[PDB]
Amino acid sequence: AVKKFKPYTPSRRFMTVADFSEITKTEPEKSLVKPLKKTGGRNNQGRITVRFRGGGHKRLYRIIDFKRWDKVGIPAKVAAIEYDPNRSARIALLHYVDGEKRYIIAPDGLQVGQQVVAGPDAPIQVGNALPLRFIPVGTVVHAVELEPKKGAKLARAAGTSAQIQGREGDYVILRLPSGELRKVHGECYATVGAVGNADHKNIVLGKAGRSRWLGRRPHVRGAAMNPVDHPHGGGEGRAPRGRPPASPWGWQTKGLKTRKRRKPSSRFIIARRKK
Amino acid sequence: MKRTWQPNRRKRAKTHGFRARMRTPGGRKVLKRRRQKGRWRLTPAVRK
RNA sequence: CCGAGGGUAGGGCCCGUGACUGGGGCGAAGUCGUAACAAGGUAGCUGUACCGGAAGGUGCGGCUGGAU
RNA sequence: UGGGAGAGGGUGGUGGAAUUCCCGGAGUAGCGGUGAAAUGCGCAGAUACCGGGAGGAACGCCGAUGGCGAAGGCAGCCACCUGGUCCACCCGUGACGCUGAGGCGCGAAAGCGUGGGGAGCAAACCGGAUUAGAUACCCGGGUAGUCCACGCCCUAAACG
RNA sequence: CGAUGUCGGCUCGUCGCAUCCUGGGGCUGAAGAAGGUCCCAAGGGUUGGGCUGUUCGCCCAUUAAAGCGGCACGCGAGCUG
RNA sequence: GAAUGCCGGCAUGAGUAACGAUAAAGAGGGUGAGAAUCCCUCUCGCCGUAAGCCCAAGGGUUCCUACGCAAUGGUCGUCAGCGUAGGGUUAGGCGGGACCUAAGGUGAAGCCGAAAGGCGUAGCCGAAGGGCAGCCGGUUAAUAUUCCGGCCCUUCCCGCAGGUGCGAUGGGGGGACGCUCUAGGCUAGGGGGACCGGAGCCAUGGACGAGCCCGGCCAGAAGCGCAGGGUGGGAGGUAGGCAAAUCCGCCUCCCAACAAGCUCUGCGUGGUGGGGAAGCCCGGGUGACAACCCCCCGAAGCCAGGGAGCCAAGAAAAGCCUCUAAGCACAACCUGCGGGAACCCGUACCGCAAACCGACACAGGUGGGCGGGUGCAAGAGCACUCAGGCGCGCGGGAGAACCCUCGCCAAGGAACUCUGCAAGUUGGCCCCGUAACUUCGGGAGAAGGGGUGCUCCCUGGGGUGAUGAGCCCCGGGGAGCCGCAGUGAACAGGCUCUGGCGACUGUUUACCAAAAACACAGCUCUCUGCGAACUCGUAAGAGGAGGUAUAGGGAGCGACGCUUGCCCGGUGCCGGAAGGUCAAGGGGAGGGGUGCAAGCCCCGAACCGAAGCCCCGGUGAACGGCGGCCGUAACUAUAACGGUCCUAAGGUAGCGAAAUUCCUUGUCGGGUAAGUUCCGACCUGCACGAAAAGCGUAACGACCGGAGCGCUGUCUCGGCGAGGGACCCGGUGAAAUUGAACUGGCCGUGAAGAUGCGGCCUACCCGUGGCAGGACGAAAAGACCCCGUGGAGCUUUACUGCAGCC
RNA sequence: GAGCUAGCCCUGGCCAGGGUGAAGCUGGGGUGAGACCCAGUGGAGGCCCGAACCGGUGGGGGAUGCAAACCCCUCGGAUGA
Numbered sequence A: 001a002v003k004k005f006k007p008y009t010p011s012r013r014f015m016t017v018a019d020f021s022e023i024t025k026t027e028p029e030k031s032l033v034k035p036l037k038k039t040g041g042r043n044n045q046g047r048i049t050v051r052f053r054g055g056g057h058k059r060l061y062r063i064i065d066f067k068r069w070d071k072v073g074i075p076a077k078v079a080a081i082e083y084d085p086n087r088s089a090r091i092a093l094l095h096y097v098d099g100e101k102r103y104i105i106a107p108d109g110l111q112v113g114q115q116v117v118a119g120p121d122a123p124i125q126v127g128n129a130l131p132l133r134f135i136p137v138g139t140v141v142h143a144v145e146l147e148p149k150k151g152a153k154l155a156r157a158a159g160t161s162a163q164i165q166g167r168e169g170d171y172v173i174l175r176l177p178s179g180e181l182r183k184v185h186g187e188c189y190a191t192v193g194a195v196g197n198a199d200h201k202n203i204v205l206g207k208a209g210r211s212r213w214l215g216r217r218p219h220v221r222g223a224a225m226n227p228v229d230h231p232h233g234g235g236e237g238r239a240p241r242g243r244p245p246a247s248p249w250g251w252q253t254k255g256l257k258t259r260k261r262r263k264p265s266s267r268f269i270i271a272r273r274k275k
Numbered sequence B: 001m002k003r004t005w006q007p008n009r010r011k012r013a014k015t016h017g018f019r020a021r022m023r024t025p026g027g028r029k030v031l032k033r034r035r036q037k038g039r040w041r042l043t044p045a046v047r048k
Numbered sequence C: 001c002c003g004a005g006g007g008u009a010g011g012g013c014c015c016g017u018g019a020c021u022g023g024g025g026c027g028a029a030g031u032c033g034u035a036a037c038a039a040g041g042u043a044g045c046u047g048u049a050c051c052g053g054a055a056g057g058u059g060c061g062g063c064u065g066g067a068u
Numbered sequence D: 001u002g003g004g005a006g007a008g009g010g011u012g013g014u015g016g017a018a019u020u021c022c023c024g025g026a027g028u029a030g031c032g033g034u035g036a037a038a039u040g041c042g043c044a045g046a047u048a049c050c051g052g053g054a055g056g057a058a059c060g061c062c063g064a065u066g067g068c069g070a071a072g073g074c075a076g077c078c079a080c081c082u083g084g085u086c087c088a089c090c091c092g093u094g095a096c097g098c099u100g101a102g103g104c105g106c107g108a109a110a111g112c113g114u115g116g117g118g119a120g121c122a123a124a125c126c127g128g129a130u131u132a133g134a135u136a137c138c139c140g141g142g143u144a145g146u147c148c149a150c151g152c153c154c155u156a157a158a159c160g
Numbered sequence E: 001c002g003a004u005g006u007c008g009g010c011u012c013g014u015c016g017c018a019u020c021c022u023g024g025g026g027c028u029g030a031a032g033a034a035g036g037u038c039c040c041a042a043g044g045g046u047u048g049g050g051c052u053g054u055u056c057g058c059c060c061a062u063u064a065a066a067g068c069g070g071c072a073c074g075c076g077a078g079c080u081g
Numbered sequence F: 001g002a003a004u005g006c007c008g009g010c011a012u013g014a015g016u017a018a019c020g021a022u023a024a025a026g027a028g029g030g031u032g033a034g035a036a037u038c039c040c041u042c043u044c045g046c047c048g049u050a051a052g053c054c055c056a057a058g059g060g061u062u063c064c065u066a067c068g069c070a071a072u073g074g075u076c077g078u079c080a081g082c083g084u085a086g087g088g089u090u091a092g093g094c095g096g097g098a099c100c101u102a103a104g105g106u107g108a109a110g111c112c113g114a115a116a117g118g119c120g121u122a123g124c125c126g127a128a129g130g131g132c133a134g135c136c137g138g139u140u141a142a143u144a145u146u147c148c149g150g151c152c153c154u155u156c157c158c159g160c161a162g163g164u165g166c167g168a169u170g171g172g173g174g175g176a177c178g179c180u181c182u183a184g185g186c187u188a189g190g191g192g193g194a195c196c197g198g199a200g201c202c203a204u205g206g207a208c209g210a211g212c213c214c215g216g217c218c219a220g221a222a223g224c225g226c227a228g229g230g231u232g233g234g235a236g237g238u239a240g241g242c243a244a245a246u247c248c249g250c251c252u253c254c255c256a257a258c259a260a261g262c263u264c265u266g267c268g269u270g271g272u273g274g275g276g277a278a279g280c281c282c283g284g285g286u287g288a289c290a291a292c293c294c295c296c297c298g299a300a301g302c303c304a305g306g307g308a309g310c311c312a313a314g315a316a317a318a319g320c321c322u323c324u325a326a327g328c329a330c331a332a333c334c335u336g337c338g339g340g341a342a343c344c345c346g347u348a349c350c351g352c353a354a355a356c357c358g359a360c361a362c363a364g365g366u367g368g369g370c371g372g373g374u375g376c377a378a379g380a381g382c383a384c385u386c387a388g389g390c391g392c393g394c395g396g397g398a399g400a401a402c403c404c405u406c407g408c409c410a411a412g413g414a415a416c417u418c419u420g421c422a423a424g425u426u427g428g429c430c431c432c433g434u435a436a437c438u439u440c441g442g443g444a445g446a447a448g449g450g451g452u453g454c455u456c457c458c459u460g461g462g463g464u465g466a467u468g469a470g471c472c473c474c475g476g477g478g479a480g481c482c483g484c485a486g487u488g489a490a491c492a493g494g495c496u497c498u499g500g501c502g503a504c505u506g507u508u509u510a511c512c513a514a515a516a517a518c519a520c521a522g523c524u525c526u527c528u529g530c531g532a533a534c535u536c537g538u539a540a541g542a543g544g545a546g547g548u549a550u551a552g553g554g555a556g557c558g559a560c561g562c563u564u565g566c567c568c569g570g571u572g573c574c575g576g577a578a579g580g581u582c583a584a585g586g587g588g589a590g591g592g593g594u595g596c597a598a599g600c601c602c603c604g605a606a607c608c609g610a611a612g613c614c615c616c617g618g619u620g621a622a623c624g625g626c627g628g629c630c631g632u633a634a635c636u637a638u639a640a641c642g643g644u645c646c647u648a649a650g651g652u653a654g655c656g657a658a659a660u661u662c663c664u665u666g667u668c669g670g671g672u673a674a675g676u677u678c679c680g681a682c683c684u685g686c687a688c689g690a691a692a693a694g695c696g697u698a699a700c701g702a703c704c705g706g707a708g709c710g711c712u713g714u715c716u717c718g719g720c721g722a723g724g725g726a727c728c729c730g731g732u733g734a735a736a737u738u739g740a741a742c743u744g745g746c747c748g749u750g751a752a753g754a755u756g757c758g759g760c761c762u763a764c765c766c767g768u769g770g771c772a773g774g775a776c777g778a779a780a781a782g783a784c785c786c787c788g789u790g791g792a793g794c795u796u797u798a799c800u801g802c803a804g805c806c
Numbered sequence G: 001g002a003g004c005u006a007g008c009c010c011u012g013g014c015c016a017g018g019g020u021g022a023a024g025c026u027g028g029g030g031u032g033a034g035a036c037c038c039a040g041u042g043g044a045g046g047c048c049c050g051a052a053c054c055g056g057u058g059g060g061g062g063a064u065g066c067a068a069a070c071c072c073c074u075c076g077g078a079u080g081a
């Protein structure tokens, strides 16, 4: 439930911050963090390949467990719920009865103290991980593997969820968070429930410097540049686009589809997204 | 105001020094060229 | 010391007046349509919303103070 | 104390009918629409028919001149939470009552904000027709909205 | 065109006279006073402000009068910009 | 003999400008051939959050001493960062290496690329980060945490004793972390003392004093004290920490818990060892058996890995501890003690600068620490001062114009001017008081005012101490005193009303533009299902992202409020399994060449045959576009209304002579005595209009308009004064420019603006200070314009290619 | 050639002093319970004033300069993009 400020500065007028009410532990599990190498959006050549990146807060990366079929049958206790700056969701600290400690992204409704488990025999309960074929149709799930053993790929962002629509052979029909209808393999794992921290979308950054903290450097409109720089550059005074609206590299950017024509995964998309 | 030559011994040796020249094909051509001209110094002198 | 009052500065209320602008009342025989009273020829009224030269129309919900 | 009837309210679930859409099949020259038509849709295979799926909304028969609520208003079914109310017994208190300027709360529809949702319907809008005109009535489309949550708005032929 | 800096202002003047004022005249449809028109005359004089970059013009308050032109539309190795 | 030729030499300008911050000098005595300039002394002035001191980088002998003065030094020079020569830099503990990792670099494995090469896991490298043992004083002309003295410590080797399951590149723990705020107790540092030590002083009217002046410490092992930091004990189970594990993790039980214990730091004390001023006398010596004490202030530093809050969620690796594995337990480790061993590089000096970066001994630039006292509310601000360091490497005169920097001004007070440009005014603190409007924060330091010093008296509270005295810190009330004036000097807002633009704090054209431009939170569209899209790359590989549609790319709009209409005919994009065209390929009706012939060989129609295009639809916060003429009302005028032509559709709401309006200073109104600007209106909008967003909007702005108040040298209109120059004298001595010059005015003439030609007029020869009208003055082979079948950036439905994509 | 400059990466460092006084918490009031109000405490912010430091607004000087971008006055930011 987002938190507001009083208008005691021009920026505090609109700034909203997460309430952090679900967080129960305010420092990371030392054995589960590693240094996150910052890039600035530079690649191994040294070249900016993603514009407008850099200068954000230092972060440590928390190792998240996107498999969970590592530990089939071994229950775990929800020990804590912590902040993770590398994703929109919160993460949950799990003390296994094994004695091993791991991190999962925290689904909505997970309570510290409850116990979770993973496998074909698991209760259809919030926080458990099963191969998609053993989840009843209509269940809202998250952290879905796109291929078996390959790792949880889909529905990881705060408040997202895919919903099982039905089964076909070895495959299950999921409705992704985008509204696409895909056939995901039944042996692919997934976790019951939707990802937590749904109010994430309602945050107002409030001022420029907030974006600077998140590593987001200022973004320049092509219309503001010169012809050497961008299809929309130049012109005396202001100027309409004066051609089909284009990216810095020439290709059009209002409607032009770019999914690869002959992609082999097309046999498994049932319906493109809507809205 | 701040001028352009801001001397630095480590910078100087890492950029123009002997080992920097030898590591790449252009740098070895520099040394070949400067030897052929008979330069008394193949490489900037830096007190290191 | 207090002190009529004079001065400087800032406020509140009222009055008159002002390019222009808003609708209102009225005015023997102007222009446009015909909304309402008959089921007034799309039953009417209605709070609201949007729209249209104009009366109005339409939507949503409501009332009969609606005819057959 | 004992009982009773009820669409009174709130929350969570969940059932079938229908419309639309999508997929498969079967099938051919029209369908639709009206006062009559036209726009529209259809040989790029529509309509009509069968099987399959997705989704939203409203709950047929029961249904009543019925019932409940202070009013607005409330109708599939199930469970939980909760208000009012009537009757019986004639047990307890002993006038503890009535009304009520202010105050506070509730308050159909439309409307507003932030998210969601969107099948059907449909202001605005577009087209077809009627007409002297037709910014209407009729027809084919169609966006808000209608639905959900939270928060506003506080109006009414809020009427007996 | 192997460069003659280009509007206006400021400062500093100097010349012309087709004279705005002041001096001298003739004619008058000159009673007087005031004026009109023309002739002679360049000695001196020819104000302060509002508006605009302005020159120019309009306007306010005066004045004997509030002249018009040349000097590389006088004058940036004098200033301004 | 000319090429703004090339190289050199030497002239002109000229004894001219200048001699590099306006912090400032004067005298005496030395030295020497020679002295404003070197040495010494006294007087004066300048810095003092430095213009003093200590590190680091860079510099590289510049350091110290002797002897020198040709050149260097903007003058001089006897002096010097200059010439010659000799000397000078000393470490187990400081810094770096024999330790560790960061980005990055490199890179056994592996991958990729015509070659050269590009990637790349481990590993290796890589520091101003982590880790690690030295403090104080003395000494040299010149080094010192390095030598010496005192007191401390570290590691390695060996030995002795005691103890233990010893043993690692492997497991684990720890190392190990942000921002703001902040407690307690200390220390550094500082103020005072009527207390302690000191050579001495009594002046010029007074003072022999509880007088003046000076100083009153630093380091220290173990113990001990104070303040902190870190830290549960035990047992049972165990399937996790890629073998093992008694460690760690997880579970259960008992005990302990604001503690304590244990451990580790800081501070104090501490055997002991050092230091020790003014003044005097010649760096020293004396003072001096120097004294070394009490109170207060007190850190941003220390305890430290302390505490609280917040979101943007804050390195690694080794040292170190623990666990075991091979192994080995005659070993090995751990603890105490002893002897021995302990290498390489730097160390001078400059270091906000005359030694570094700027061609210079250049008013510029250069990271870290210390940076004293008083007063002013505070402070690193300001003024003056300590320690310390300087007077800026040309001087002496004079007292013109004119320039710069500065002070003052009668009356007026913006009349100046494009503009109050500039300069006044205002100015700190305390108190009173404060409007429209508003997003309820604000606007606000609104505006406007009053107070401010010194002396006496009475008194409230706090810190330290003890509850008191003393010292210190906030106050309150009463009575007075002086001046023109009490933030008496220095530092320290002028204000208001009203428009345009942009919400705002930010960002920009290094070196003519700081803005209304860019950015910005926010809104919309679009693409992307993850080996994502997109980007860089031939590729491998990277970024995206160790992210997953509440996410990532692209685009436009630009807080917020109220809103964003109509057009899909053209272009773009999206959808469409029909049709039309459609290349290679398939096909092979039918021809052809050659051979005697089997054959060999060439051409080739129908028909099949993709994407693209055509075609059919959709689509505007996609590219874009959103009419003309004529008539009409009972005064007139104007047309709600009508007629007709055209369109894909004819501009909606809201704005409007506007950052847009040509005619234009539109017209009307306001403000002024007067208003081409301004504000408010009207609407025939040359040529607004809705995310190239429309209309508004509190707050904000070194933005751009208009007005008022205050106050002024801006002005009427100028005057005087100060200093630095200009001027004169001694010293040193440039520059662009320059065909040669014996270089006047007028009216003419001339390639059309003549010192140089003609005619006339004027004029003795040469300078110095001044002024700028001419020498079509200087500078730059016009940057505007044209020309060149000259060049370059940029565009597109110009041509033709290529990448990329299909 | 990134020892200037532009961005990013790693690792350190710096920002006198003064002012305003958000959330929260505590108490009091209020109520069926609440919202809420008041006081104190608190110490938020691309908050306010102002050195260091980073800048470069206006004017003057400078213009063969002290300087191939400097000097004086004045002015912007100064816990943050």
Ligand SMILES: [K+]
Pocket: F784
């Ligand atoms: K031109």
Ligand SMILES: [Mg+2]
Pocket: A006, A007
């Ligand atoms: Mg508020």
Ligand SMILES: [Mg+2]
Pocket: A018, A019, A020, A021, A022, A023, A090, A197
């Ligand atoms: Mg949370």
Ligand SMILES: [Mg+2]
Pocket: A030, A031
């Ligand atoms: Mg680790």
Ligand SMILES: [Mg+2]
Pocket: A037, A038, A039
């Ligand atoms: Mg990376």
Ligand SMILES: [Mg+2]
Pocket: A044
């Ligand atoms: Mg690399």
Ligand SMILES: [Mg+2]
Pocket: none
């Ligand atoms: Mg590289």
Ligand SMILES: [Mg+2]
Pocket: A049, A050, A051, F535
């Ligand atoms: Mg990019």
Ligand SMILES: [Mg+2]
Pocket: A040, A041, A042, A048, A049, A050, A051, A052, A053, A054
């Ligand atoms: Mg980038």
Ligand SMILES: [Mg+2]
Pocket: A086, A087, A088, A157, F547, F551
């Ligand atoms: Mg994320």
Ligand SMILES: [Mg+2]
Pocket: A082, A083, A084, A085, A087, A088, A089, A090, A091
């Ligand atoms: Mg999170």
Ligand SMILES: [Mg+2]
Pocket: A146, A147, A148, A183, A184, A185
């Ligand atoms: Mg699959």
Ligand SMILES: [Mg+2]
Pocket: A018, A019, A197, A199, A200, A201, A203
């Ligand atoms: Mg959130």
Ligand SMILES: [Mg+2]
Pocket: A201, A202, A203
């Ligand atoms: Mg968002």
Ligand SMILES: [Mg+2]
Pocket: A056, A057, A058, A085, A213, A214, A215, F312
């Ligand atoms: Mg960040």
Ligand SMILES: [Mg+2]
Pocket: A211, A216, A219
């Ligand atoms: Mg962004």
